[PDB]
């Protein structure tokens, strides 16, 4: 060969792809504490409704 | 004719007031919504004509 070729650069090329955010999500629950007792008899079932 | 008039001093008098009933005052627990009460009904004796 040129045998200077040697010296010559070899790169690598490096395929990229850009992204952009997610998104944030919500959700809530609204448990009261004294019409929602009239309903379950014992405090278990009122924990387990809760949970 | 200048000067700015002295308070003395601010009593807040004041006296809590009874119930006259506390000794009624059971204490459960906040479950379920209704509640029953019954006794028994009476039952007469019977003279027994073992015929």
Same mark, same amino acid.
């Not at chain 2, 004041?14 to 009874?18: E, K, T």
């Given at each position: +060969?040129?045998?200077? %070729?040697?010296? +010559?650069? $070899?790169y690598?090329?490096?395929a990229? =792809? %850009?992204?952009g955010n997610?998104?944030? =999500?919500? !959700? =809530?629950?609204? %448990?009261n $504490? $004294?019409?929602?007792?009239?309903?379950? !008899?014992? %405090?278990?079932?009122?924990? $387990?409704?809760?949970? | 004719?200048?000067?700015? /008039?002295?308070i003395?001093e601010?009593?807040?008098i004041? #006296?809590?007031?009874?119930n006259?009933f506390?000794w009624?005052?059971?204490?459960?627990?906040? #479950?379920g919504?209704? *509640?029953?009460?019954?006794? #028994?009904?009476?039952?007469v /004796? #019977?003279?027994?004509?073992? *015929?």
């Open positions: +060969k040129n045998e200077e %070729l040697m010296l +010559k650069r $070899n690598p090329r490096m990229t =792809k %850009l992204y997610g998104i944030v =999500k919500k !959700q =809530k629950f609204t %448990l $504490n $004294n019409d929602t007792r009239f309903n379950f !008899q014992t %405090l278990a079932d009122a924990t $387990n409704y809760a949970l | 004719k200048y000067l700015f /008039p002295k003395n601010t009593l807040l004041d #006296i809590a007031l009874g006259r506390n009624l005052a059971k204490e459960q627990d906040f #479950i919504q209704y *509640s029953e009460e019954y006794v #028994i009904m009476d039952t /004796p #019977i003279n027994m004509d073992l *015929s």
